[PDB]
Design a protein around this ligand. Structure first.
Ligand SMILES: [Zn+2]
Lengths: 729, 135, 708
């Protein structure tokens, strides 16, 4: 542990060999054992500053990062006939209240005393679990629970037909039709579009589906009152037939324009009466009708930081979908510029999310083909909640002032979530509106009201409790370096859209400068507290990431999609992306976790992201969260080539290698176990490709060695040198 | 001559099954839940209420209330024939589980039969009071 | 015999003039009570004339260019001929260099005065059939209609192109044969579209119009799977039916794909248009469809705006050269009054029944596709009529299924009648019974040449040429020769065509009577102010009777009929030959009794005997009436007894005679079996009998012998 002080100039090896654990709030033993899991709910400062003045002096951002709908191992479900809430601020009774009269409880957020209803009260499950799910009563619904409604909207233009994406998507829908969340009330629908809009009717009385073409692009309408959204249970056979015919109907298409705007307007009209989830697959710039977007020239390594949408059509449309409980998920499989900076608004403000597959092609791009396959598997089978809202409460004195993530902020800070999905993350920024001189603990409560895929109104509640400190040092001792990096990234993305990429990159650098300068003016080299010894490293990693990098050759839609991930992803996968984990894997052995039964999993140490840590003699696995890259050195041992890769020499390693073979060797068993254990830590199955040789030109592997200098960015050492010059200026 | 169907347990007004399609709903859905609250063991078991351009119809069987709303011009004869079709089906399927449930809409899946039955009445091919009184 | 002359000239030339001897002076031309006019049947069938396969041969005076004909003076020595219209002398074309006296071309023999040429120079275009189907109707009616359309698909030529348009609330244009999916383009029936717009929204054959031999199996299965308009019909409402937009899309589709070629737009409606442009009535069931009484008291807010929409469509189709048929079967009115211009301007059919699920409609619909002795349809497309006259004759206009090409020349008269101001007309669709009325004006031997270019059902381009000539009246006896040439039947129909045309484009009876009284004074015989002295010759004696029945007919007394029934009767009367036209004006009546074979009897109450069977042919209706005695004898059961096989011959004698005419007639007449006291005997009682003919004649004689 330690309250020690570190000189970043003399260490340079501060990154530990074992995974980073989130800090433990400085709380009494019995309080901390009840606290919310940090994977679900965590704060940038585990010790809340008592006043806004103290928060300002530390020059660190105060905020929460939440993963509210995350898949859980075990979830207590109270079905109580009554839900116990505070009569003033409607806070749910939670483990951190104060029982006094044993029939009266004091709210930990508004301090009002309440009456425990005749319904050992501190033994009740609502007071033993920081995370709990309630059944909602009749008053908590505006309407009967909506059924699950899935509408798939496919681009079928000539460019789309060429990518061949339709074949895999229709195959995944076929394989996963019985796994779609829902009961017998589930409805499914299909729309394709090119210059016109194509609905599909499904009837057991008709020999085949029927394609209904709306050609009036300026005045779309629903051509049929029934059978466009059909009951999946009743019409399973008709849906399966359609999915087999769709990839073959447009082989010889000469349509080259795409009317994405009008298609979404018709898709909205079709979903308006029920709500649900709308999956949109688009492969090019929208060029026809409302929502047309102008072409643009991609930047190169030479242009400086000189982002925002080009129209508000998709934001307005997304706002209308939010009002009807419709969420739009965007799958952009484009080979050229598509103005994602404007298309992304359809998902940001409707609580959807965007998935990007640059230069998808069924024959030319095997990596993107397998990536879409695996991401669609998760998309179609994960749990889902409909027509949802979220409220976030904190103790009197603390005020949320900025929200980050995919939703719509209604009045009085109701977060509107047409869909809630278990892979979405959110962030919130707060300030101390009133001095916390009164209390010594503060609490945070998020509550998610949603409709399950079974038709049951449920409320998921998480409650977090933290202590209040009154000195600069205690603020620094509780700092969570990763959560600070996450919130800063969300803030820099907003700064980019609001100002420029230069301003966002400056404010990121100045966050390190001002914080360490504040620390220095309150104690030669660059002295940081132990809890911030990775702060310049992660911030430098932020500045070389695809969201904020400068002198690189990055294309517009790449940068936008990297920002959309910052806004939407949970903290963990933002850390795995910004600062991938680097292990040596040609020499695994038996210091592992041999604990999980018959498996022995090696546990190689984490290396720092420098080419100095590589070796032409070995092999190195890089865990980047969504993908795993296995780099083989040119001078790699013959044991690793034959016993792990299945190849007699470096030259016969196939160019795209989409995975490792499973050979009958112990070295093979070790690396397969280590890789197995890595992807079991997550639901989004990450693809491994071993192709990163030194010659396949796929070694963007090196774009992640964030400690090394490049022609357009500093090294980690240069960075520390620049911080120090600014700190004691 | 359109729609709003709700099936509720008379005692506490617990909703059991409903079905509504728009493409307002908020005012008449409230009035419906008012009715369920007021109705008790002394209430008329077959009734029609007048809400201006709209008209409520309901029957009460085995402590369960079957309510429908439509424009005042919709044939009152058909509104009650539609409720009997639902009651016989619903009582046959869940009539004995009704008095035990405690969640709202514990029978959402009765949605399906409601709408296949509903379409056999909104296609041409007892007491009377003013709802504002009862409320 | 003047009768043999009239009869033989209709058989050979398919024409019948009101006067066969024409006024030779300006003083008689202006003073003609009934105008010189011709009932002309451009495609009349006859005993197998040889179709002549060569270019016709024409007068070379650019203004003239008449066709070589038997009235032309030829010189087989000098290889010359003299145009009988402009006196221009012409050299014989190379392929005629070998013609001789013994052997001469067909067009010069008087036998071939009406003759047909086949012009084979370009590839032939396929026929085009576009079905436009309503889906807002009962299941039994829609099922019957689907089977009728499938049956007609198996009679079309292999090379013809077919399309399908269905409608209700929306309009669907089906793209045939797509395989694995059936697709169509959907449009709101709430707003209209132009051909240009429609062409851009949709993108020899098309994707929407495909050859039968490639598409027929898919079309049969599509037509078999057609279902009711999926939109529900609320209580007390009519279904939303967008007939006007569906028709404007069918027209627009063909207009931007195959303009200026033969095409048939066959529309099947099962009710009135209740939405869009062309609307006929609102969707409230409580509001009845308009009646003539509603029309006259200005309680029909849809007639004029709806009529305007379909007239625009009719002219669009007729300009393009396409044909619109309206097949309308329903228990209520359907909007024929507003849509009549589409099959009237074009040569389109108009069929009207109570349901598509009757023998009446099913048999009528298949007569449409009657073939000749070569397996080829008895229809023609893109007909162009051009009339050339002597310098003394001018054309006032035409009345019939035709549109003007607005071509000017010295033959065009200033006094225009009907579709006038032209010597060229277009007739998008014609059959062997299509009869035009051409009205002439004089400003021996006058001559007129009828030239009809049209596309045969086989694809061949054809020219039919009829050339007739009538004597100029000898100046010594101008009115005596003229009065001997009067065709009273032809003139009655020709004057009747003039009266219906003025009523349907608004008192008309006052014009009919002044002309009748005037015809009495000029050509009758009488002492002044002695009504009993009036007599007509055999040449004029039936004209008053034809005029009595015409002025009481449902062609002119529109009340007691629905507006759609008035337009249906008038539709078929403006197209028919003379024989059928007379039957419409004056139904023919046959008597059946033990006392002698079947005999014609007067259309008077005095022919209704109690022991007699009457069979009345109304053209529209075949009616059998069993008198009171025969009704009882037949209510008794005497027919079954072997004793009374004579009472069976009697009861089945009119039934047998009905079956024969109940086939030949294209609009299959409704068949009625009734008796004394029966409800349907009303039809016999209203056609029978001012109050009567005797009173009508006496009043006419009083005015004939009095002031001019
Ligand atoms: Zn409270």
């Amino acid at each position: 542990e330690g309250l020690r002080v570190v000189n970043l100039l003399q260490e340079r090896n501060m990154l530990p060999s074992t995974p980073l654990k989130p800090p433990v709030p400085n709380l009494h033993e019995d309080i901390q054992k009840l606290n919310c899991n940090p994977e679900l709910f965590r704060c940038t400062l585990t010790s809340i500053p008592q006043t806004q003045a103290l928060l300002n002096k530390a020059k660190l951002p105060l905020g929460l990062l939440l993963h509210p709908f995350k898949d859980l191992v075990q979830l207590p479900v109270v079905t109580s006939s009554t839900i116990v809430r505070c009569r003033s601020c409607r806070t749910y009774i939670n483990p951190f209240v104060s029982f006094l009269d044993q029939r009266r409880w004091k709210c930990n957020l508004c301090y009002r005393v309440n009456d425990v209803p005749e319904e050992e009260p501190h033994r009740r499950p609502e007071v033993q679990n920081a995370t709990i799910e309630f059944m909602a009563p009749s008053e908590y619904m505006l309407r009967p629970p909506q059924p699950p409604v899935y509408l798939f909207v496919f681009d079928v233009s000539h460019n789309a037909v060429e990518t061949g994406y339709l074949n895999s998507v229709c195959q995944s829908l076929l394989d996963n039709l019985d796994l779609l969340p829902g009961n017998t009330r589930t409805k499914i629908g299909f729309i394709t579009f090119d210059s016109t809009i194509h609905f599909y009717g499904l009837q057991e009385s008709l020999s085949q589906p029927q394609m209904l073409i709306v050609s009036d692009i300026e005045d779309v309408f629903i051509p049929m009152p029934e059978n466009l959204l059909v009951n999946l249970n009743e019409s399973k056979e008709l849906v399966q037939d359609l999915l087999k015919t769709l990839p073959q109907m447009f082989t010889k298409t000469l349509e080259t324009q795409s009317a994405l705007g009008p298609a979404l307007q018709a898709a909205f009209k079709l979903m308006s009466p029920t709500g649900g989830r709308m999956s949109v697959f688009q492969t090019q710039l929208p060029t026809l009708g409302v929502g047309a977007l102008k072409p643009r020239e991609e930047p190169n390594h030479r242009s400086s930081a000189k982002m925002t949408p080009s129209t508000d059509f998709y934001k307005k449309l997304a706002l209308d979908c939010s009002g009807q409980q419709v969420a739009v998920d965007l799958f952009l499989l484009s080979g050229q510029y598509s103005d994602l900076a404007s298309l992304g608004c359809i998902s940001r403000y409707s609580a959807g999310s965007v998935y990007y597959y640059p230069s998808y092609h069924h024959q030319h791009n095997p990596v993107q083909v397998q990536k879409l396959q695996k991401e669609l598997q998760r998309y179609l089978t994960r749990k889902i909640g409909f027509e949802a809202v979220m409220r976030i409460r904190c103790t009197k004195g603390l005020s949320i002032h900025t929200f980050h993530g995919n939703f719509f902020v209604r009045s009085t800070d109701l977060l509107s979530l047409p869909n809630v999905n278990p892979d979405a993350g959110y962030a919130v920024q707060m300030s101390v509106e009133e001095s916390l001189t009164d209390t010594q603990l503060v609490s945070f409560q998020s509550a998610l009201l949603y409709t399950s895929s079974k038709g049951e109104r449920r409320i998921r509640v998480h409650t977090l409790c933290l202590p209040v400190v009154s000195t600069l040092n205690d603020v620094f001792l509780g700092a969570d370096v990763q959560a600070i990096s996450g919130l800063l990234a969300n803030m820099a993305v907003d700064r980019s859209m609001t100002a420029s990429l230069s301003d966002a990159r400056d404010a990121l650098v100045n966050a390190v400068i001002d914080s360490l300068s504040a620390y220095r003016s309150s104690v030669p080299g660059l002295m940081v507290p132990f809890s911030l010894r990775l702060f310049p490293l992660f911030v430098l990693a932020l500045l070389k990431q695809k969201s904020f990098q400068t002198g690189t050759n990055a294309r517009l839609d790449e940068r936008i999609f990297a920002m959309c991930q910052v806004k939407n992803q949970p903290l963990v996968y933002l850390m795995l992306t910004t600062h991938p984990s680097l292990y040596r894997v040609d020499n695994l052995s038996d210091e592992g976790a041999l604990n999980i039964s018959d498996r022995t999993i090696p546990q190689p140490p984490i290396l720092q992201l420098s080419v100095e840590k590589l070796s032409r003699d070995g092999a190195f696995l890089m865990d980047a969260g969504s993908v795993l890259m296995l780099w083989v050195g040119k001078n790699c041992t013959q044991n690793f080539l034959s016993q792990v890769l299945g190849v007699q020499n470096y030259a016969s390693i196939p160019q795209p290698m989409t995975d490792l073979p499973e050979l009958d060797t112990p070295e093979s068993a070790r690396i397969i176990a280590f890789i197995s254990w890595l992807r079991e830590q997550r639901p989004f199955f990450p693809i491994l490709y071993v192709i990163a040789d030194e010659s396949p030109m796929k070694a963007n592997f090196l774009q992640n060695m964030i400690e090394d200098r490049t022609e357009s960015a500093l090294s980690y050492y240069e960075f520390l040198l620049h911080i120090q010059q600014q700190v004691n200026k | 001559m359109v729609l709003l169907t709700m099936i509720a347990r008379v005692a506490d007004g617990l909703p059991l099954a409903a079905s509504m399609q728009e493409d307002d709903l908020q005012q008449y859905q409230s009035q419906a839940k008012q009715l369920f609250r007021k109705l008790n063991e002394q209430s008329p078991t077959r009734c029609t209420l007048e809400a201006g351009a709209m008209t409520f119809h309901y029957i009460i069987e085995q402590g369960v209330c079957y309510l429908v709303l439509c424009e005042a011009a919709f044939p009152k004869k058909l509104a009650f024939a539609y409720l009997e079709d639902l009651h016989s089906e619903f009582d046959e399927q869940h009539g004995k589980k009704v008095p035990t449930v405690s969640r709202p809409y514990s029978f959402i899946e009765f949605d399906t039969f409601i709408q296949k039955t509903k379409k056999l009445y909104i296609d041409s091919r007892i007491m009377v009071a003013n709802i504002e009184e009862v409320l | 015999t003047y009768l043999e002359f009239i009869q033989q000239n209709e058989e050979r030339d398919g024409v019948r003039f009101s006067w066969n001897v024409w006024p030779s002076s300006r003083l008689e031309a202006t003073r003609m009570v009934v105008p010189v006019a011709a009932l002309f049947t451009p495609l009349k069938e006859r005993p197998d004339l040889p179709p002549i396969q060569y270019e016709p041969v024409l007068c070379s005076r650019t203004t003239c260019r008449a066709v070589l004909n038997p009235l032309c003076q030829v010189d087989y020595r000098a290889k010359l001929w003299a145009c009988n219209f402009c006196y221009q002398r012409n050299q014989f074309p190379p392929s005629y260099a070998g013609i001789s006296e013994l052997n001469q071309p067909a067009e010069l023999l008087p036998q071939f005065s009406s003759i047909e040429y086949v012009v084979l120079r370009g590839p032939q275009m396929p026929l085009i059939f576009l079905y436009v189907v309503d889906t807002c109707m009962e299941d039994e009616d829609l099922q019957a209609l689907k089977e009728s359309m499938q049956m007609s698909l198996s009679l079309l030529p292999p090379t013809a192109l077919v399309g399908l348009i269905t409608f209700g609330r929306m309009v669907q244009v089906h793209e045939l044969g797509c395989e694995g999916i059936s697709k169509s383009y959907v449009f709101r029936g709430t707003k209209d579209l132009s051909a240009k717009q429609l062409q851009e929204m949709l993108g020899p054959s098309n994707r929407f119009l495909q050859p039968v031999q490639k598409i027929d199996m898919n079309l049969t299965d599509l037509l078999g799977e057609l279902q009711r308009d999926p939109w529900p019909v609320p209580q007390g409402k009519r279904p939303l039916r967008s007939s006007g937009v569906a028709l404007s899309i069918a027209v627009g589709l063909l207009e931007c794909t195959f303009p200026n070629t033969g095409a048939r737009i066959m529309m099947f409606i099962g009710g009135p248009a209740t939405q869009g442009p062309g609307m006929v009535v609102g969707d409230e069931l409580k509001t009845p469809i308009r009646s003539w009484h509603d029309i006259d008291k200005d309680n029909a807010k849809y007639v004029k705006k709806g009529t305007k929409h379909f007239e625009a469509l009719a002219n669009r189709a007729a300009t393009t050269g396409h044909v619109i048929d309206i097949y309308a079967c329903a228990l209520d009115q359907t909007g024929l009054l507003e849509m009549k211009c589409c099959p009237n301007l074009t040569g389109g059919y108009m069929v009207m029944g109570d349901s598509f699920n009757t023998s009446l409609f099913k048999q009528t619909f298949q007569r449409v596709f009657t073939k000749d002795m070569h397996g080829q349809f008895k229809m023609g497309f893109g007909g162009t009529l051009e009339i050339k006259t002597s310098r003394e004759i001018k054309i006032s206009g035409a009345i019939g299924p035709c549109v003007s090409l607005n071509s000017k020349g010295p033959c065009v008269s200033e006094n225009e009648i009907g579709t006038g101001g032209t010597c060229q007309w277009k007739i998008c669709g014609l059959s062997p019974t299509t009869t035009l009325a051409i009205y002439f004006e004089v400003v021996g031997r006058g001559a007129i040449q009828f030239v009809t270019q049209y596309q045969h059902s086989s694809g061949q381009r054809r020219i039919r040429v009829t050339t007739i000539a009538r004597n100029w009246a000898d100046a010594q006896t101008q009115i005596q020769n003229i009065a001997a040439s009067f065709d009273q039947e032809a003139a009655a129909i020709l004057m009747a065509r003039l009266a219906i045309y003025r009523a349907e484009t608004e008192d008309v009876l006052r014009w009919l009577d002044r002309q009748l009284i005037r015809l009495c004074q000029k050509f009758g015989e009488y002492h002044k102010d002695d009504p009993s002295s009036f007599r007509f010759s055999e040449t004029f004696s039936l004209y008053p009777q034809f005029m009595f029945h015409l002025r009481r007919s449902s062609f002119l007394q529109v009340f007691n009929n629905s507006p759609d029934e008035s337009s249906y009767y008038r539709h078929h009367f403006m197209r028919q030959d003379l024989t059928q036209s007379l039957i419409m004006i004056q139904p023919i009546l046959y008597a059946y009794s033990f006392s002698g074979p079947p005999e014609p009897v007067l259309l008077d109450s005095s022919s209704i005997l109690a022991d007699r069977i009457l069979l009345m042919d109304t053209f529209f209706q075949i009616l059998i009436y069993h008198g009171e005695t025969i009704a009882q004898w037949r209510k008794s059961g005497y027919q079954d007894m072997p004793e009374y096989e004579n009472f069976r011959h009697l009861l089945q004698a009119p039934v047998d005679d009905a079956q024969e005419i109940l086939h030949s007639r294209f609009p299959m007449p409704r068949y009625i079996d009734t008796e004394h006291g029966g409800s349907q005997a009303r039809f016999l009682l209203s056609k029978v009998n001012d109050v009567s003919l005797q009173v009508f004649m006496d009043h006419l004689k009083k005015l004939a012998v009095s002031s001019a």
